[PDB]
Symmetry: D2
Subunit: 122 residues, 4 copies
């Protein structure tokens, strides 16, 4: 699914996910969030299953963004975990965990969870 | 926290997380799971905040493993999202999302969630 | 939002959520899942904020179903946590955690996570 | 596990979970959080598997607290999903989702996730 995954994706928030899928299972690229303490692109890296089943199942993958770049630092990191579904209207359906650096006393409050769906159009 | 993070970590399941933290915010290394459809090491990649706050807060980070290697393929990927806490007994406290590739009809059933704590000893 | 919440809702899977919102903040009713090890209705109980903000924010709520009834027992329980959004096309947007009873050795594998959106029509 | 579950539990934060397990699978009681926008007891309700497997597996359960009482309203609700494990040192191991009522524009930011372990002593 190297061809399928590689390219520019957009989620329901208007965020922009630009990713290259390597033959070796690597995901590399940049993320631009439309919301939160973020601006411009952030480096991302991740992994996908480069030899998925051939039974109609999606392709498992994930990636991470640490929310620091040359412009801003939000002292947090999000990971997206999901699968790529090919075909007519390709999608990457994910759930994500956003952890902010906290003191021990506030750690119970450290992690947001949500879900993003990415498509090739937006 | 480049020095702090880099090295060998172990979680409560006996899994082994071997990671190098780069000056540029990169996480690279290998993961060996003690449970599940897995054996030997898998490539991981991720990101950490390379300029965290100086107020006692932890350092945000995350990484991804796609569960394919030269031995096995589980058609799944886990992402860990959490923070590194330095000091006397350093810890990386995470929550994780494990997504398996599924058909659309089974997608509701695609994602496990849990939490792992990593320490420098085990 | 007692009036708004009370009634029959349906999610994207075709499941049926029948709920009564009490003046005291109680949620009571029945759930019928369209997927998984389930058939017919299961008792649910839960809670909602009976005095929400008046600033356009949604109404926080949650409920639990244990997957045992007179027909089947799946030895599991799901909790939905989310908010009710009123207006033209009312919605209850949730994320859920489905925990299966496991042995200690399999506990890492005990919990599924996902998201369901409920509307008054389907 | 009616006998096992019923009683007073405490988590790692010092919160107090007081619960009665009914023969019909009901959970009823009160929760007192040691952290966050909360004070004194809040009503809880939930469900547990009243006929669990007899193979060493834990007992699935869940409950909800809406964070409104006679003293405070935080416009939020937490659901705990997990399992009760009996024996020498009984535990209820959970993961939780805390949803705050938000505007649509802030909904991506609505839900915290974490994990609490409850024991009979603290
Ligand atoms: Rh969705
Ligand atoms: Rh923990
Ligand atoms: Rh959605
Ligand atoms: Rh734990």
């Amino acid at each position: 699914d190297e061809a399928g995954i590689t390219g520019t994706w957009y989620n329901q928030l208007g965020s922009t996910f630009i990713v290259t899928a390597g033959a070796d299972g690597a995901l590399t690229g940049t993320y631009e969030s439309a919301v939160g303490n973020a601006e411009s692109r952030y480096v991302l890296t991740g992994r996908y299953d480069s030899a998925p089943a051939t039974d109609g199942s999606g392709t498992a993958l994930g990636w991470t963004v640490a929310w620091k770049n040359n412009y801003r630092n939000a002292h947090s990191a999000t990971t997206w975990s999901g699968q790529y579904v090919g075909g007519a209207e390709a999608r990457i359906n994910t759930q994500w965990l956003l952890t902010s650096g906290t003191t021990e006393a506030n750690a119970w409050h450290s992690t947001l969870v949500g879900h993003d769906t990415f498509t090739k159009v937006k």
